[PDB]
Design an enzyme around this catalytic site. Structure first.
Site, short mmCIF file in Angstrom:
data_model
loop_
_atom_site.label_atom_id
_atom_site.label_comp_id
_atom_site.label_asym_id
_atom_site.label_seq_id
_atom_site.Cartn_x
_atom_site.Cartn_y
_atom_site.Cartn_z
N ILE A 1 -3.40 11.38 0.80
CA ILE A 1 -2.05 10.87 1.02
C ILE A 1 -1.20 11.16 -0.20
CG2 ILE A 1 -0.65 8.84 1.39
CD1 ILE A 1 -2.87 7.67 3.05
N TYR B 1 -15.11 3.31 9.08
CA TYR B 1 -14.15 3.71 10.10
C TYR B 1 -14.74 3.53 11.49
CZ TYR B 1 -11.58 6.00 6.30
OH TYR B 1 -10.89 6.28 5.15
N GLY C 1 0.80 -1.20 0.00
CA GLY C 1 0.00 0.00 0.00
C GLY C 1 0.84 1.26 0.00
N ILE C 2 0.14 2.40 -0.02
CA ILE C 2 0.84 3.67 -0.12
C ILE C 2 1.52 4.02 1.20
CG2 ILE C 2 -1.27 4.97 0.41
CD1 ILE C 2 -0.13 7.02 -1.75
N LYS D 1 -12.26 11.02 6.20
CA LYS D 1 -13.67 10.70 5.98
C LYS D 1 -14.43 10.49 7.28
CE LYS D 1 -14.14 7.71 2.11
NZ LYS D 1 -13.10 6.81 2.69
N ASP E 1 -5.16 -13.28 1.60
CA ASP E 1 -6.40 -12.51 1.53
C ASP E 1 -7.05 -12.49 2.91
OD1 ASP E 1 -9.11 -11.60 1.10
OD2 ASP E 1 -8.81 -12.08 -1.03
N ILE E 2 -7.00 -11.33 3.58
CA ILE E 2 -7.51 -11.22 4.94
C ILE E 2 -9.02 -11.22 5.02
CG2 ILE E 2 -5.42 -9.94 5.64
CD1 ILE E 2 -7.10 -7.42 5.62
N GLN F 1 -5.28 2.44 10.51
CA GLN F 1 -5.32 3.67 9.73
C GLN F 1 -6.71 3.86 9.14
OE1 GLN F 1 -1.95 5.05 6.85
NE2 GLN F 1 -3.87 5.03 5.70
N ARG G 1 -1.30 -9.76 -3.73
CA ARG G 1 -0.57 -9.89 -4.98
C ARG G 1 0.82 -10.45 -4.74
NH1 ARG G 1 -2.39 -4.54 -8.46
NH2 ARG G 1 -3.49 -3.45 -6.77
N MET H 1 -6.01 4.68 -4.03
CA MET H 1 -6.14 6.13 -3.95
C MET H 1 -4.74 6.73 -3.92
SD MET H 1 -8.43 5.85 -0.55
CE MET H 1 -10.15 6.34 -0.50
N1 NAD Z 1 -5.12 6.40 -0.23
C1 NAD Z 1 -5.39 7.51 0.34
O1 NAD Z 1 -5.18 8.64 -0.23
C2 NAD Z 1 -6.09 7.58 1.70
C3 NAD Z 1 -6.20 8.93 2.38
C4 NAD Z 1 -6.74 9.01 3.38
C5 NAD Z 1 -7.10 7.82 4.23
N2 NAD Z 1 -6.96 6.58 3.62
C6 NAD Z 1 -7.29 5.58 4.43
O2 NAD Z 1 -6.06 4.60 4.71
C7 NAD Z 1 -6.47 3.24 4.89
C8 NAD Z 1 -5.58 2.52 3.93
O3 NAD Z 1 -5.59 3.04 2.66
P1 NAD Z 1 -4.32 3.02 1.58
O4 NAD Z 1 -4.67 3.93 0.69
O5 NAD Z 1 -3.12 3.08 2.53
O6 NAD Z 1 -4.28 1.58 1.03
P2 NAD Z 1 -3.76 1.25 -0.36
O7 NAD Z 1 -4.87 1.04 -1.32
O8 NAD Z 1 -2.85 2.29 -0.74
O9 NAD Z 1 -3.05 -0.18 -0.24
C9 NAD Z 1 -3.61 -1.22 0.45
C10 NAD Z 1 -2.69 -2.36 0.65
O10 NAD Z 1 -3.29 -3.59 1.20
C11 NAD Z 1 -3.25 -4.66 0.29
N3 NAD Z 1 -4.53 -5.37 0.15
C12 NAD Z 1 -5.69 -4.92 -0.43
N4 NAD Z 1 -6.70 -5.80 -0.46
C13 NAD Z 1 -6.33 -6.73 0.36
C14 NAD Z 1 -7.02 -8.03 0.92
N5 NAD Z 1 -8.18 -8.30 0.66
N6 NAD Z 1 -6.23 -8.75 1.66
C15 NAD Z 1 -4.95 -8.41 2.07
N7 NAD Z 1 -4.47 -7.24 1.66
C16 NAD Z 1 -4.88 -6.39 0.85
C17 NAD Z 1 -2.93 -4.09 -1.18
O11 NAD Z 1 -2.34 -5.09 -1.88
C18 NAD Z 1 -2.14 -2.91 -0.81
O12 NAD Z 1 -0.83 -3.38 -0.58
C19 NAD Z 1 -7.87 3.15 4.42
O13 NAD Z 1 -8.80 2.90 5.42
C20 NAD Z 1 -8.18 4.60 3.77
O14 NAD Z 1 -9.55 4.86 4.10
C21 NAD Z 1 -6.36 6.55 2.41
C1 STR Z 2 -8.32 18.90 -1.63
C2 STR Z 2 -9.50 18.05 -1.30
O1 STR Z 2 -10.52 18.19 -2.06
C3 STR Z 2 -9.59 17.00 -0.35
C4 STR Z 2 -9.37 17.57 1.21
C5 STR Z 2 -10.18 16.70 2.32
C6 STR Z 2 -10.42 15.39 1.33
C7 STR Z 2 -11.47 14.56 1.55
C8 STR Z 2 -11.63 14.19 3.07
C9 STR Z 2 -10.64 13.18 3.41
C10 STR Z 2 -10.71 12.00 2.41
C11 STR Z 2 -10.21 10.86 2.64
C12 STR Z 2 -10.36 9.55 1.89
O2 STR Z 2 -9.76 8.58 2.10
C13 STR Z 2 -11.45 9.59 0.68
C14 STR Z 2 -11.51 10.93 0.08
C15 STR Z 2 -11.71 12.12 1.27
C16 STR Z 2 -13.04 12.20 1.46
C17 STR Z 2 -11.11 13.34 0.73
C18 STR Z 2 -11.42 13.77 -0.76
C19 STR Z 2 -10.72 14.98 -1.19
C20 STR Z 2 -10.73 16.13 -0.15
C21 STR Z 2 -11.98 16.83 -0.13
#
Ligand code: NAD
Ligand code: STR
Length: 364
Positions: free
Chosen positions: A181, A154, A11-12, A122, A56-57, A118, A39, A190
């Site tokens: 992120i 969440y 993941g990221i 949202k 696969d969790i 994490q 993967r 994402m």
């Molecule tokens: N991506 C973002 O911009 C973002 C921003 C804000 C908050 N979040 C929150 O962070 C949390 C994690 O998001 P992310 O973006 O870090 O994840 P991600 O999508 O970037 O990566 C997820 C990781 O978990 C692994 N994976 C996915 N499906 C799976 C399964 N079924 N079994 C085992 N592993 C699995 C993938 O292979 C990948 O390595 C989420 O709850 C998200 O809501 C993400």
């Molecule tokens: C620059 C911007 O539009 C961002 C700032 C706050 C962010 C939202 C609120 C935080 C966020 C987290 C997620 O993981 C899904 C998308 C959302 C819901 C974001 C979508 C894009 C937003 C609205």
């Protein structure tokens, strides 16, 4: 010595945790690192001393299979999720994913100290479908205000985590809520930076202008974000600091910005000519980039990039989802009051993560 489990290592933020935990100067280091995913191990995850595990969790059997032998786990970093049509389906899928993992780890790991989960910003604005459509609390968002009266996976995961840690004395938890992120992970669902880089590389190859695909509030209003390495340090900090135990924390870079300025940064980094926000347009990369896979494969061979399929590397729906709505900010006071003083320069982070995608030959 400490042994970490990264649920979602490709993941990221998991990729940041896989790179940072085995560092020599990392708190509570040295670190033994297991990394869970589905993967096979990609090429940007290979040069880390991580004990990869395919699982696969969502399947409770593969979770008992693959994770029961893991005895020495001291800390767990849940950093994955699953998308569904409605939020109710996300509550079910993501609650079961977290439950399958915890049901195995807590009894079969005698030294388990901490579990960090994490979630995201949202938590304050609501699920994708309801965003901008429901009365939220007034920004900047603080951690310990009441939950919204809507479904949210969440919330479902937090309640689950609180019950699960009870089954062990001295077991402790933390949840981290980042904004958008900025990071590097081609497998991410994402990855905003990676998506914006591809769109810039396609505008470059076609000679077309890098137009802003979003609203005026994202272009002209204040935005913030969360650097992936900073989120990783935020996880590690709460995992090892006893004065951050059993608490929820926001995690954002500590500064604001405007996509008006960042657009010229993105434009400068790919040789494109910067376009401005055009009124009454509402441009969607999901629409604009429809059927552009040949142009991508043309860019890949003409610039010697790694073999990538446009769908994996660009999540247009996400990019459109973030730029179509205003940015409500969060507060980092609770984290700073608990001693976490880390931060990032959002402009430098943007360039840094753009250049990491270039470095790994994902974009030109
Ligand atoms: N991506 C973002 O911009 C973002 C921003 C804000 C908050 N979040 C929150 O962070 C949390 C994690 O998001 P992310 O973006 O870090 O994840 P991600 O999508 O970037 O990566 C997820 C990781 O978990 C692994 N994976 C996915 N499906 C799976 C399964 N079924 N079994 C085992 N592993 C699995 C993938 O292979 C990948 O390595 C989420 O709850 C998200 O809501 C993400
Ligand atoms: C620059 C911007 O539009 C961002 C700032 C706050 C962010 C939202 C609120 C935080 C966020 C987290 C997620 O993981 C899904 C998308 C959302 C819901 C974001 C979508 C894009 C937003 C609205």
């Amino acid at each position: 010595s400490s042994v970490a489990l990264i649920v979602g290592v490709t993941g990221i933020v998991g990729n940041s945790l896989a790179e940072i935990l085995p560092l020599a100067d990392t708190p509570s280091g040295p670190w033994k690192v297991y990394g869970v995913a589905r993967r096979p191990r990609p090429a940007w995850n290979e040069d880390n001393p991580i004990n990869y595990i395919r699982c696969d969790i969502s399947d409770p059997k593969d979770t008992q299979e693959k994770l029961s032998p893991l005895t020495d786990i001291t800390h767990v970093f849940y950093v994955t999720w699953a998308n569904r049509s409605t939020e109710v389906e996300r509550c079910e899928a993501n609650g079961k994913m977290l439950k399958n993992v915890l049901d195995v780890v807590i009894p079969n790991c005698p030294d388990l100290k901490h579990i960090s989960l994490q979630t995201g910003r949202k938590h304050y604005v609501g699920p994708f479908e309801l965003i901008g459509k429901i009365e939220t609390h007034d920004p900047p968002f603080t951690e310990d205000l009441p939950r919204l009266k809507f479904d949210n996976f969440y919330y479902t995961q937090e309640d689950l985590l609180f019950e699960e840690v009870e089954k062990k004395e001295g077991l402790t938890w933390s949840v981290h809520r980042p904004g958008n992120i900025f990071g590097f992970s081609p497998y991410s669902m994402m990855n905003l930076v990676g998506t914006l880089c591809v769109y810039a590389a396609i505008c470059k190859h076609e000679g077309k202008v890098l137009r802003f695909p979003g609203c005026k509030a994202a272009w002209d209003g204040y935005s913030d974000c969360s650097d992936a390495d900073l989120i990783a340090e935020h996880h590690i900090w709460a995992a090892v600091d006893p004065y951050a135990k059993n608490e929820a924390f926001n995690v954002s870079n500590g500064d604001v910005f405007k996509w008006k300025h960042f657009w010229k940064v993105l434009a400068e980094q790919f040789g494109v000519e910067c376009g401005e926000y055009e009124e009454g347009e509402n441009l969607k990369l999901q629409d604009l980039m429809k059927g552009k896979e040949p142009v991508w494969e043309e860019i890949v061979r003409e610039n010697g990039l790694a073999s990538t399929n446009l769908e994996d590397v660009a999540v247009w729906w996400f990019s459109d989802a973030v730029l179509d709505i205003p940015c409500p900010l969060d507060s980092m006071n609770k984290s700073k009051e608990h001693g976490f003083l880390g931060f990032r320069n959002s402009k430098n982070s943007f360039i840094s993560w753009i250049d990491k995608a270039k470095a790994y030959k994902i974009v030109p």
